[PDB]
Amino acid sequence: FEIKKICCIGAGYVGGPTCSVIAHMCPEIRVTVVDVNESRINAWNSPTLPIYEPGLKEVVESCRGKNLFFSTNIDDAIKEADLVFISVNTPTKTYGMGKGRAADLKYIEACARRIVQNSNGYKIVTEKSTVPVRAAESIRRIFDANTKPNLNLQVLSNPEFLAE
Amino acid sequence: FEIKKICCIGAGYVGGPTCSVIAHMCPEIRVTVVDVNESRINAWNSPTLPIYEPGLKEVVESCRGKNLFFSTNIDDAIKEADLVFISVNTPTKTYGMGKGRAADLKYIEACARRIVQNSNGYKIVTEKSTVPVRAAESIRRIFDANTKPNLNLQVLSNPEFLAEGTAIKDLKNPDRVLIGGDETPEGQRAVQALCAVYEHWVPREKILTTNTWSSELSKLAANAFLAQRISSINSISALCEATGADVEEVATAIGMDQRIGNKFLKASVGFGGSCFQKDVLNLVYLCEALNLPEVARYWQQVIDMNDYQRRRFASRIIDSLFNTVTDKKIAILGFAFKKDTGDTRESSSIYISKYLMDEGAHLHIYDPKVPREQIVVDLSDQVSRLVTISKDPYEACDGAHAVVICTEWDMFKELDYERIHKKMLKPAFIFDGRRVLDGLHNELQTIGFQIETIGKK
Amino acid sequence: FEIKKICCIGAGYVGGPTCSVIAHMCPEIRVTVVDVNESRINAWNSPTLPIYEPGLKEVVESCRGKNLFFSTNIDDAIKEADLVFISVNTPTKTYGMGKGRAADLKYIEACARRIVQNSNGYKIVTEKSTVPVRAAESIRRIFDANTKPNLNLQVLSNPEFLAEGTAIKDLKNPDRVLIGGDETPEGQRAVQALCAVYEHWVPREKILTTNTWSSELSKLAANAFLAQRISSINSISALCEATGADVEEVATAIGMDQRIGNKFLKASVGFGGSCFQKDVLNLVYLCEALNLPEVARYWQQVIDMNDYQRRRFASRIIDSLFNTVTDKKIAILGFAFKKDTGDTRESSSIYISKYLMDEGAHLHIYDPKVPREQIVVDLSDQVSRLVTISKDPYEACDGAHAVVICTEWDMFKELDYERIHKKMLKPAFIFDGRRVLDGLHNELQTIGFQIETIGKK
Ligand SMILES: NC(=O)c1ccc[n+]([C@@H]2O[C@H](COP(=O)([O-])OP(=O)(O)OC[C@H]3O[C@@H](n4cnc5c(N)ncnc54)[C@H](O)[C@@H]3O)[C@@H](O)[C@H]2O)c1
Ligand SMILES: NC(=O)c1ccc[n+]([C@@H]2O[C@H](COP(=O)([O-])OP(=O)(O)OC[C@H]3O[C@@H](n4cnc5c(N)ncnc54)[C@H](O)[C@@H]3O)[C@@H](O)[C@H]2O)c1
Ligand SMILES: NC(=O)c1ccc[n+]([C@@H]2O[C@H](COP(=O)([O-])OP(=O)(O)OC[C@H]3O[C@@H](n4cnc5c(N)ncnc54)[C@H](O)[C@@H]3O)[C@@H](O)[C@H]2O)c1
Ligand SMILES: O=c1ccn([C@@H]2O[C@H](COP(=O)(O)OP(=O)(O)O[C@H]3OC[C@@H](O)[C@H](O)[C@H]3O)[C@@H](O)[C@H]2O)c(=O)[nH]1
Ligand SMILES: O=c1ccn([C@@H]2O[C@H](COP(=O)(O)OP(=O)(O)O[C@H]3OC[C@@H](O)[C@H](O)[C@H]3O)[C@@H](O)[C@H]2O)c(=O)[nH]1
Ligand SMILES: O=c1ccn([C@@H]2O[C@H](COP(=O)(O)OP(=O)(O)O[C@H]3OC[C@@H](O)[C@H](O)[C@H]3O)[C@@H](O)[C@H]2O)c(=O)[nH]1
């Protein structure tokens, strides 16, 4: 089994530069970075990127629209994907248990739900962040409980080590 | 010698049904029940009663108008009466010495004064409540200090043992009737006159008679004993959870020992009701005051356990929703402190709702008897942002992640769980706070629920 | 599968009685009771049994040498047996972790090792104790590690509910029999084999079956519920003394609530016995180990109350004797932890004797069933100077400043107190730490006794 289409939900400091580089290094792979933040997506597609990162602009411009894409169309990106990265943010809870301290997993949970909804057959789903807090476990729970016939979702952890 | 007219001040859970039952068993007696709350009196006379209580409608209609009355005319009823019951609330003090712990006698005290401003000659005056704290003494202190010639008022203590949802049954065959009065020739004649009333439907073997203080301690103590058992079994429910046992099984084996008995061993999200918590608080308070901190310390645990049982239950719900419940829709089935009443005082359902609201949950509450505008009042922006009162249970479980059963309403046992499931977000949790879905366990798993329940795994 | 031979390791207060009743109710089955302690075994084989227990002499003397045997030959009894009871003692650790709290399992362990050494083929091994504290698991650990081909040892749990003093009547008519075994085909077959022993005299609906853990938890919990009831009522006895009430009247009142039951509500100087303190102490210790500190501190109150109640009573004694006993002759009536047994383990009498001895009293101790050598061991040079063991009670109160009734022996109610009052120093005090002298109160005041009693000022 070979990955030929990659989707990444989350075009942040992690999702963006990680996907850009996978694209640079693997020309036969299609890499699609998605995000709900329309503004951040257009900026990725503009001559001014939404984050500053030395040497990033060269990488993006060497494969954007070639094997690297940025888009607000999350649904179709997941649908055609072999691997789905989850590369979203887990803000600190502002009330209740673990307030000021624990991570809020709500955006990971929303990615898992959306993935199940837009998925059939076999896909690999990889949580990729700098602080993974029970992320893979939580993805698995959603997937286990939202079975479809011939949907086979594989859950992996692939933590990101880069420093901004 | 002999009681023919009864007044009852307070038309609440205690005054209302108990006088209703006296009427029914004692046709020769004219019973009048009075309250400042016109709105409550009106309902007592309407075809819809202000409280829900099985058999209560039929008992009231059986003799309202004939020998049973409700009116806002306090003065006239006091005036014509041989016996005046006080059955009023005593809210917890909001300020002063023992703010937030001791009962406030400010309504019981107002009652006694109003009695003297409307009484001449002989009257028997009886304190009657679920939790009596120095109630007889503070009626007496007021009678002693408002002395009119020819006025002879005798003070009796007559604790009410009934449990809401089972009031009529309890009233009609009680395990015992406790009446305390001064051990003077005069107190004895008033005690005996009170006996003679109950003697209409209760065997004399079961009528116990003491002095007034020993009467109140007896009820303080007994209520606490009942609460201790539930806290005790709830402590075991945490142990069972942490080790693979099942508290229902542990309780069967405990209860079959006749020296312990098998009642009051149903583990739960925690006791509520207007009786237990305040009864322990008061007993604690009393012991601190009397220089008995070992005893205070002893009974305080009954409350700490209950608080912790509530908290542990909440925190399991939140855990399962992987510590985030912002905008997640959760159903709350059951708001009363217990089945077969509309009463929410100190209900565990409130407390769960509060811990789930702090997590930002969208709560959808259904209860078949609690008035919608009472749920709203109990949970008080935050309420208007997070709370919906559901009309039926199915719209409460529509779009929901979790179903939380907080009251043991028998109806919950036979909801359409298949239908509820189809429409829940997955994974779909039922948290049975009452062990009410037991044995139904296999069917629910099969359907596709994750069933968490107290004292199992 | 058919049990023909039973061996029981531990010929104590549990094993001797229990095995005798099985022998008596199962005449087809050979019943062998073994022990390392030879004077114990010798006594069981003698006209004078080593423990006192109503009805026991009759039952033994009816089976001994027929199907009931007491031997020191542990190896051969294990070797031939189909079922092997383990019924040995578990003393409190005297050092290391859990010092003074956790039970020491060194004897359970040596039994299981001995059983593997002496066994071949199929045996059922059953742990029977009043307080089982990870017993079954411990046995299993050893059996699992020491295998032999065709050796098949199956472990069950069978907690004993008998109370000393009524052992025979409890074993012949238990409220229930509790038996745990693995949720395995082999476990289930061993469980049946034991039910069938019990089914010779216990009806099937009174026998409960479960896993080993649940069974041990149920026992730990029930024992605890029982001691709570006593601490609970004892706490109300203090409160009664502070406010001028009678705990016997309050207890009567509480007790008639059929949800509380009327049993185990006799206030006392304190519960004793091998069971209760050690049960709660182990329940607490375990809760802490499972990270349940709220459950831990809940149960701890049961013990703390009982320590207070003992103390209150000791110092209440010293206050009535003008704040000093530092040379006075005091009578101790009752050394055993409860009536109708010569057992003294954890007895409240040991604690009152001792406190009074720190304080300079000369004690004269009478019990009708406790050997005098046992009283000397329980108190620990001081014994030399202060303690005297009396032969009858009237010898004990000759010269005395006060009588202190520690144990509810029925003979104490029927003493001629006028004779006693005569030879007692004056004014003559009786401290009734058991309420055995209720109703006789005035009569004794008439004689001029000044009488102090628990739960009554
Ligand atoms: N972004 C934050 O504000 C934040 C705060 C605390 C912790 N974290 C955690 O620390 C590391 C930061 O990651 P990042 O710096 O690249 O964060 P980032 O916030 O810069 O990128 C996260 C992107 O995911 C997008 N996103 C979130 N939920 C989505 C959804 N459901 N569908 C589509 N897009 C969605 C967000 O719009 C955001 O653009 C993360 O790896 C995570 O472990 C992030
Ligand atoms: N008041 C509280 O908040 C509260 C909370 C817990 C327990 N309790 C205890 O419960 C028992 C009584 O129970 P209940 O359920 O029937 O109370 P309730 O609140 O249901 O009924 C009390 C009735 O007394 C009426 N009332 C009060 N003072 C009055 C006065 N001076 N004159 C005329 N009417 C007056 C009120 O309007 C009300 O209808 C007592 O033991 C009480 O102390 C009270
Ligand atoms: N020892 C204690 O202080 C104690 C206290 C509370 C509870 N318990 C538990 O509750 C029950 C109380 O038992 P009991 O009152 O009959 O105690 P017991 O002291 O009266 O009898 C125990 C018998 O076991 C014998 N024994 C011990 N180890 C042995 C061995 N290795 N081989 C052969 N015989 C051995 C002892 O000699 C003694 O005769 C027990 O089943 C025990 O597990 C023990
Ligand atoms: O010697 C130092 C090094 C770093 N820092 C500070 O420590 C903070 C973190 O700096 P980093 O170099 O680690 O940059 P990052 O925080 O972007 O990366 C860090 O978090 C994400 C992980 O995936 C990276 O492996 C980790 O280095 C910065 O504020 C930096 O100024 C110091 O004050 N002193
Ligand atoms: O086994 C049990 C028993 C009771 N409970 C809870 O304990 C609380 C009290 O329930 P009760 O049945 O005792 O009802 P009440 O509070 O109406 O009556 C209580 O106070 C009034 C007294 O006069 C009654 O004798 C006493 O029972 C409820 O929250 C109930 O659900 C349990 O959780 N488990
Ligand atoms: O109401 C009571 C009851 C009991 N007690 C005291 O509590 C202590 C225990 O007495 P028990 O009647 O329970 O006798 P035991 O200790 O022999 O039995 C206890 O432990 C072993 C278990 O099998 C029994 O079921 C349990 O009762 C004694 O000190 C007794 O005098 C009270 O002080 N008041």
mmCIF file with all atom_site columns, C-alpha atoms in Angstrom, chain C residues 137-196:
data_model
loop_
_atom_site.group_PDB
_atom_site.id
_atom_site.type_symbol
_atom_site.label_atom_id
_atom_site.label_alt_id
_atom_site.label_comp_id
_atom_site.label_asym_id
_atom_site.label_entity_id
_atom_site.label_seq_id
_atom_site.pdbx_PDB_ins_code
_atom_site.Cartn_x
_atom_site.Cartn_y
_atom_site.Cartn_z
_atom_site.occupancy
_atom_site.B_iso_or_equiv
_atom_site.pdbx_formal_charge
_atom_site.auth_seq_id
_atom_site.auth_comp_id
_atom_site.auth_asym_id
_atom_site.auth_atom_id
_atom_site.pdbx_PDB_model_num
ATOM 1  C CA . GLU C 1 137 ? -6.232  -13.947 46.171 1.00 0.00 ? 137 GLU C CA 1
ATOM 2  C CA . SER C 1 138 ? -3.288  -14.720 48.371 1.00 0.00 ? 138 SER C CA 1
ATOM 3  C CA . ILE C 1 139 ? -4.055  -18.447 48.400 1.00 0.00 ? 139 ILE C CA 1
ATOM 4  C CA . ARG C 1 140 ? -4.468  -18.386 44.588 1.00 0.00 ? 140 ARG C CA 1
ATOM 5  C CA . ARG C 1 141 ? -1.100  -16.694 44.142 1.00 0.00 ? 141 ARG C CA 1
ATOM 6  C CA . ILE C 1 142 ? 0.542   -19.572 45.884 1.00 0.00 ? 142 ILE C CA 1
ATOM 7  C CA . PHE C 1 143 ? -1.428  -22.332 44.196 1.00 0.00 ? 143 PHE C CA 1
ATOM 8  C CA . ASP C 1 144 ? -0.780  -20.738 40.785 1.00 0.00 ? 144 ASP C CA 1
ATOM 9  C CA . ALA C 1 145 ? 3.027   -20.758 41.412 1.00 0.00 ? 145 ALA C CA 1
ATOM 10 C CA . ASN C 1 146 ? 3.395   -24.232 42.824 1.00 0.00 ? 146 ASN C CA 1
ATOM 11 C CA . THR C 1 147 ? 1.892   -26.637 40.253 1.00 0.00 ? 147 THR C CA 1
ATOM 12 C CA . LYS C 1 148 ? 2.266   -30.440 39.933 1.00 0.00 ? 148 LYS C CA 1
ATOM 13 C CA . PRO C 1 149 ? 0.911   -32.681 37.181 1.00 0.00 ? 149 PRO C CA 1
ATOM 14 C CA . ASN C 1 150 ? -2.738  -33.702 37.997 1.00 0.00 ? 150 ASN C CA 1
ATOM 15 C CA . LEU C 1 151 ? -2.827  -31.373 41.032 1.00 0.00 ? 151 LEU C CA 1
ATOM 16 C CA . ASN C 1 152 ? -5.989  -29.320 40.679 1.00 0.00 ? 152 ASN C CA 1
ATOM 17 C CA . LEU C 1 153 ? -6.624  -26.959 43.576 1.00 0.00 ? 153 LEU C CA 1
ATOM 18 C CA . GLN C 1 154 ? -9.653  -24.700 43.318 1.00 0.00 ? 154 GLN C CA 1
ATOM 19 C CA . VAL C 1 155 ? -10.025 -21.673 45.551 1.00 0.00 ? 155 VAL C CA 1
ATOM 20 C CA . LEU C 1 156 ? -13.263 -20.428 47.087 1.00 0.00 ? 156 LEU C CA 1
ATOM 21 C CA . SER C 1 157 ? -14.299 -17.793 49.579 1.00 0.00 ? 157 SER C CA 1
ATOM 22 C CA . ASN C 1 158 ? -16.875 -18.584 52.287 1.00 0.00 ? 158 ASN C CA 1
ATOM 23 C CA . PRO C 1 159 ? -16.961 -15.773 54.935 1.00 0.00 ? 159 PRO C CA 1
ATOM 24 C CA . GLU C 1 160 ? -18.368 -16.642 58.381 1.00 0.00 ? 160 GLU C CA 1
ATOM 25 C CA . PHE C 1 161 ? -21.330 -14.508 59.704 1.00 0.00 ? 161 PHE C CA 1
ATOM 26 C CA . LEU C 1 162 ? -21.704 -16.172 63.064 1.00 0.00 ? 162 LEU C CA 1
ATOM 27 C CA . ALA C 1 163 ? -21.302 -13.940 66.149 1.00 0.00 ? 163 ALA C CA 1
ATOM 28 C CA . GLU C 1 164 ? -19.628 -15.410 69.147 1.00 0.00 ? 164 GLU C CA 1
ATOM 29 C CA . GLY C 1 165 ? -22.116 -16.222 71.954 1.00 0.00 ? 165 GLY C CA 1
ATOM 30 C CA . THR C 1 166 ? -24.735 -17.326 69.456 1.00 0.00 ? 166 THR C CA 1
ATOM 31 C CA . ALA C 1 167 ? -22.526 -19.437 67.114 1.00 0.00 ? 167 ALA C CA 1
ATOM 32 C CA . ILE C 1 168 ? -24.553 -22.630 67.186 1.00 0.00 ? 168 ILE C CA 1
ATOM 33 C CA . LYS C 1 169 ? -27.868 -20.902 66.567 1.00 0.00 ? 169 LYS C CA 1
ATOM 34 C CA . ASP C 1 170 ? -26.272 -18.722 63.803 1.00 0.00 ? 170 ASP C CA 1
ATOM 35 C CA . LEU C 1 171 ? -24.671 -21.695 61.996 1.00 0.00 ? 171 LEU C CA 1
ATOM 36 C CA . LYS C 1 172 ? -27.904 -23.722 62.141 1.00 0.00 ? 172 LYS C CA 1
ATOM 37 C CA . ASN C 1 173 ? -30.046 -20.841 60.859 1.00 0.00 ? 173 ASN C CA 1
ATOM 38 C CA . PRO C 1 174 ? -28.005 -18.266 58.941 1.00 0.00 ? 174 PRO C CA 1
ATOM 39 C CA . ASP C 1 175 ? -29.772 -15.297 57.376 1.00 0.00 ? 175 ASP C CA 1
ATOM 40 C CA . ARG C 1 176 ? -27.533 -16.192 54.431 1.00 0.00 ? 176 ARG C CA 1
ATOM 41 C CA . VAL C 1 177 ? -24.541 -18.135 53.262 1.00 0.00 ? 177 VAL C CA 1
ATOM 42 C CA . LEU C 1 178 ? -22.154 -16.331 50.982 1.00 0.00 ? 178 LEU C CA 1
ATOM 43 C CA . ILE C 1 179 ? -19.797 -18.222 48.631 1.00 0.00 ? 179 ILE C CA 1
ATOM 44 C CA . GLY C 1 180 ? -17.527 -16.864 45.926 1.00 0.00 ? 180 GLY C CA 1
ATOM 45 C CA . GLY C 1 181 ? -15.677 -18.729 43.213 1.00 0.00 ? 181 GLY C CA 1
ATOM 46 C CA . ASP C 1 182 ? -14.160 -17.998 39.814 1.00 0.00 ? 182 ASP C CA 1
ATOM 47 C CA . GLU C 1 183 ? -16.379 -17.202 36.898 1.00 0.00 ? 183 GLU C CA 1
ATOM 48 C CA . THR C 1 184 ? -14.961 -20.337 35.258 1.00 0.00 ? 184 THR C CA 1
ATOM 49 C CA . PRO C 1 185 ? -16.384 -23.807 34.558 1.00 0.00 ? 185 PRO C CA 1
ATOM 50 C CA . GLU C 1 186 ? -13.968 -25.208 37.230 1.00 0.00 ? 186 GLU C CA 1
ATOM 51 C CA . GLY C 1 187 ? -14.832 -22.354 39.631 1.00 0.00 ? 187 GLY C CA 1
ATOM 52 C CA . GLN C 1 188 ? -18.563 -22.972 39.130 1.00 0.00 ? 188 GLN C CA 1
ATOM 53 C CA . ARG C 1 189 ? -18.230 -26.764 39.817 1.00 0.00 ? 189 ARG C CA 1
ATOM 54 C CA . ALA C 1 190 ? -16.398 -26.123 43.103 1.00 0.00 ? 190 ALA C CA 1
ATOM 55 C CA . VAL C 1 191 ? -19.033 -23.555 44.092 1.00 0.00 ? 191 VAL C CA 1
ATOM 56 C CA . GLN C 1 192 ? -21.824 -26.195 43.543 1.00 0.00 ? 192 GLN C CA 1
ATOM 57 C CA . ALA C 1 193 ? -19.895 -28.823 45.501 1.00 0.00 ? 193 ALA C CA 1
ATOM 58 C CA . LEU C 1 194 ? -19.865 -26.450 48.548 1.00 0.00 ? 194 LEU C CA 1
ATOM 59 C CA . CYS C 1 195 ? -23.549 -25.391 48.070 1.00 0.00 ? 195 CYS C CA 1
ATOM 60 C CA . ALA C 1 196 ? -24.523 -29.056 48.283 1.00 0.00 ? 196 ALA C CA 1
#
